[PDB]
Amino acid sequence: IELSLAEALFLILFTGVISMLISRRTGISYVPIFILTGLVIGPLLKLIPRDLAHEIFDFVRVFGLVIILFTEGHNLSWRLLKKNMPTIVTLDTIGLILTALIAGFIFKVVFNSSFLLGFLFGAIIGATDPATLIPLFRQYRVKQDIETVIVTESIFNDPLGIVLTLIAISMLVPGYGGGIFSTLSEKLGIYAGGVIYFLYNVSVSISLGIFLGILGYKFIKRTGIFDFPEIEAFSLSLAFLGFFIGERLDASGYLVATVTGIVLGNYKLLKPRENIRILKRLQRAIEKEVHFNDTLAALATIFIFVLLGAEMNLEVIWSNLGKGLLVALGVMILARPLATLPLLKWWNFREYLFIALEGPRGVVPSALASLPLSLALKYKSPLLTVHWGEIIMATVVITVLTSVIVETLWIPILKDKLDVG
Amino acid sequence: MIELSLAEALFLILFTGVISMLISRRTGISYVPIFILTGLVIGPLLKLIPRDLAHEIFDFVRVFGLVIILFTEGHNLSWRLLKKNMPTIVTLDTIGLILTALIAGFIFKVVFNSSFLLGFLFGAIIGATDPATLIPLFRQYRVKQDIETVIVTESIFNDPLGIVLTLIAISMLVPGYGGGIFSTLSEKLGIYAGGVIYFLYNVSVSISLGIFLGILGYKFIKRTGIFDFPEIEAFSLSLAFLGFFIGERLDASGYLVATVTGIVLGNYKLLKPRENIRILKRLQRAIEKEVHFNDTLAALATIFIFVLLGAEMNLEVIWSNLGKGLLVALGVMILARPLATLPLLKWWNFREYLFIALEGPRGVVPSALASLPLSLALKYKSPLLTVHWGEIIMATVVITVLTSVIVETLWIPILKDKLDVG
Ligand SMILES: CCCCCCCCCCCCCCCCCCCC(=O)O[C@H](COC(=O)CCCCCCCCCCCCCC)COP(=O)(O)OCCN
Ligand SMILES: CCCCCCCCO[C@@H]1O[C@H](CO)[C@@H](O)[C@H](O)[C@H]1O
């Protein structure tokens, strides 16, 4: 009486729900709880096969990522962005890159891998998910501007961490470069081609995202889309429209969708103020939309973390426990602050250090974690090996768990030393 | 016709569907023929959605969509109004349904040479009703509250049972679904008596279990204080599907379990007579948000169902038996439905009865079950049902849906004028 695929998916959902409940009730972060649940229903009870978790992940990756990043777009205020523009821009143009690179050198050293493979690991481990941190920021009443900068940086790095990961793989394997990557690389080498392609991708993604967000907003006003179930379905369709159009012209559809989310989140700012009645109407609409889509992003998160927990291979992670652990603490202590370094050039050091140290790794790399493995199994290419895929995945899991728990636990005392003085 | 990705296909269905939804609400036209026409456009007309792919999508949207749609439907039922018109409701969902399916089987078998089981399958498919496209005209013309309650509740119970009957007709024609309680009972007391007793069994067990998991659900939520986003939505979805799978493992329609669960959750006030208002407030709000989510999902499911149905038909078979199918549809509307609706017309004035009869078209559930016999034919090679006959059934169902919906949504003012002088 083994579980069918439907009962399997549902098992993931239900178990994830219970895990969520006990997580909230107890006060423990949802990340290691969801991972734990994964291992429980996974390799332990063998209720869910890892080789199936691969494919379920092959859907939940694209879907969940797009919807989650889109939902993240809404929680961004353009005002606070432009007010603290340089800091954020540095955090999402330099700090990310340097984090990924140092992390890559670390990986290369610890596992004797290539620096390109390490760069893949770093690109995966680049983005940050502080959604695990926020409740403590609130209940300990940390600086509002700090929370602003951190959260904003995350919202921006989540899709950037992806396109970074897509770069490294595109370098390792020329499979489905799209055309832009292929052309730009064949004209200006692999690395420089990667740089200019990064610039291109970012440019077109931001542009198209803003464009589609605005046009969608205006479309809503014109056609009058404020009532159930039009607003939800339309907004969803808009997000995935941005994603598919973006990916169609070789741009990060994730980033596009995120940007669209930012636009809709800042609908009150872009076009002329209407009468308070209309503003309230649009407000209600956006509230409904946000509700539905954020519910979807919640489910998606649950599935991502649980699947990851049920997909890992115990023997591989144990044979490299210490190694990947020191890679984790290595990137938490050495990489992140080193990359953060130019912050104190425009910030106070006591601020800069907290901002550096605090940022952990979360959902996005957890989704990207199995990608190199699955891609290795499928494409079956010599450059990246299946074993190294297992290595990557294991490491990513380790640094995710360790970063999350260490940040979550070391945050209280760290305020006392940085607030009081 | 450049090949799309699977994801691009799904998204295309979504986008086009939403566009057609907007257009539907704006123009005032029923969403059903707009959706189906849309699917037809992006389907065989443009070949952006290969029919094979359509089958593959519909094999998922069937399960997931139907479950969530029905579970959503459960919420909109009042036990009070049920008590108010209990015998009528029970009659319609039980007797009138079976009779409808049977007569439809007769007609279907008449139009072209077939087994009576094929026709019975056809009737069991279109057994359920969907007045969702009628309500905007009901409140528009201030129609009697009682009859609306009757029709709505009727459809609410007809949607799962219609599948159960469809589950029955399938169980006979295929050896796969055979092995089970139904096989035992039918072999024991003949196909007829066995069918009836398995009907009673499935209904009873599914209902009782749905009530059980419903109460257990409400009590659980009550104890662990599930009100804050997003615990409630996730837990609700989990609950509905739990009921589904558990119910299905006991050889009973899990859909019916989902519906009953939805009924239980819908009538939260009725469970505890006295409870301090605060609790009822938080509960009402949480339930409301949950309803928003699950109903949005239900809408998406509806769209996908109708559009997919639109893209899954082939104009060759459709045209080939065009007149035939039309005769079937008209036969069902004009003859079958009222003939099956007569039993408890004793409680209702003849004009009102003729109204109830002449109303109640076929929508979502038959649209989902339309391609079911074809898929099974393509997968299980029955000596009873063929692929082409699956095509005949799906086509006939499509025509039935279009005709019934369009007419019964369009003729309502005139009909009201006939029974209520105007
Ligand atoms: C994680 C993000 C959360 C939000 C996502 C949307 C909400 C879903 C949340 C998770 C739901 C948990 C509950 C599990 C649902 C049960 C799924 C049933 C799957 C199933 O059995 O499919 C089988 C085949 O699948 C196949 O053939 C594969 C078909 C491939 C296309 C599937 C695409 C699905 C997209 C649906 C989107 C529309 C829904 C509204 C969002 C059917 O096989 P059978 O038994 O019928 O075979 C015999 C007939 N001859
Ligand atoms: C079923 C037809 C109505 C569907 C829309 C459901 C309306 C739910 O409205 C809900 O009200 C809550 C009250 O705080 C808000 O917090 C939620 O954001 C909002 O979605």
Task: Tell me whether residues A225 and B299 touch, CB distance under 8 A.
Answer: no
Cβ atoms of B96 and B158 closer than 8 Å: no
Residue B32 host element (H or E): helix B31-40
What does the alpha-carbon distance between residue B418 and residue B118 come to, in Å, rounded to a whole number?
A: 36
Backbone angles phi, psi at B230, to 5 degrees: -110, 25
Distance in Å, CA B263 to ligand 2 centroid: 19
Rounded to whole angstroms, the Cα distance separating A82 from A89 reads: 10
Q: Which residue of B has its CA nearest to A12?
A: B238
**Centroid of ligand 2 to alpha carbon of A147 (angstroms):** 29
Quote the CA–CA distance of A114 and A108 in Å, as a whole number: 6
Contacts of B27 in chain A (CB under 8 A): none
Distances (CA, A) of A259 to A84, A207, A276, B80: 18, 9, 26, 49
Documented resolution in Å: 3.2
Residues 7-36 of A with CB under 8 A from B: 7, 10, 13-14, 16-17, 20-21, 24-25
Q: Does B76 touch chain A (CB under 8 A)?
A: no
Pick from B280, B300, B290, B299: nearest CA to B235: B290
CA of B5: which chain A residue's CA is closest? A244
Candidates A17, A299, A302, partner chain B, best to mutate (most B CBs within 10 A) = A17
Q: Do B234 and A302 touch (CB under 8 A)?
A: yes
How does DSSP classify residue A75?
Answer: T
CB A74 within 8 A of CB A292: no
Rounded Cα gap, residues A337 and A102, in angstroms? 11
Determine contact, residues A78/A262, Cβ cutoff 8 Å: yes
Amino acid at A186: E
**CA A135 remoteness from chain centre:** 19
Q: Cis check for the bond before B160: say yes or no (omega within 30 of 0).
A: no
| Residue from B251, B244, B318 nearest B74 by CA | B244
Q: How far apart are CA A230 and CA A191, in angstroms?
A: 45
Q: Which ligand is nearest to the CA of A292?
A: 2
Q: Residue B152 to residues B85, B123, B259, B359: CA-CA distances in angstroms? A: 12, 20, 14, 11
Rounded CA gap, B257 and B208, in Å?
8
Query: Which of A:253-312 have CB within 8 Å of B?
Result: 288, 291-292, 294-295, 298-299, 302
Q: How far is A83 from chain B (nearest CA, A)?
A: 31
In short, whether A14's Cβ falls inside 6 Å of ligand 1 is no
Up-side HSE of residue A403: CA atoms within 13 Å toward CB?
34
State whether B295 and A7 contact (CB < 8 Å). no
Domain count, chain B: 1
> Which of A232, A248, A256, A289 to mutate: most B Cβ within 10 Å?
A232
Alpha carbons B220 and A25: distance in angstroms, whole number: 14
Tell me if B299 CB under 6 Å of ligand 1: no
Measured between CA atoms, how close is A14 to chain B, in angstroms?
5
Q: Residue B140 corresponds to which amino acid? A: Q
Rounded to whole angstroms, how far apart are CA atoms B239 and B215? Answer: 11
**Alpha-carbon distances, residue A413 vs A132, A133, A406, A410 (angstroms):** 17, 14, 12, 6
CA–CA gap between residue A375 and residue A166 (Å, rounded): 12
C-alpha to C-alpha distance for B138 and B124, rounded to whole angstroms: 27
- The conformation of residue B422, written as its DSSP 8-state character, comes to -
Q: Is A295 within 8 Å of B299 when comparing Cβ atoms?
A: no
Check B14 against A62: CB less than 8 A apart.
no
Q: Alpha helices of B139-180 — where are they, by DSSP H?
A: 145-173
How many residues are present in chain B? 422
- Closest residue in chain B to residue A302, using alpha carbons only: B234
Q: Would you call B231 and A24 a contact, using CB atoms and an 8 Å cutoff?
A: yes
For residue A411, what are the domain limits? Answer: 1-421
A244 closest CB neighbour out of B8, B26, B237: B8
Q: Of A166, A128, A25, nearest to A339 (Cα)?
A: A128
Tell me if B292 and A294 make a contact (CB, 8 A cut-off): no
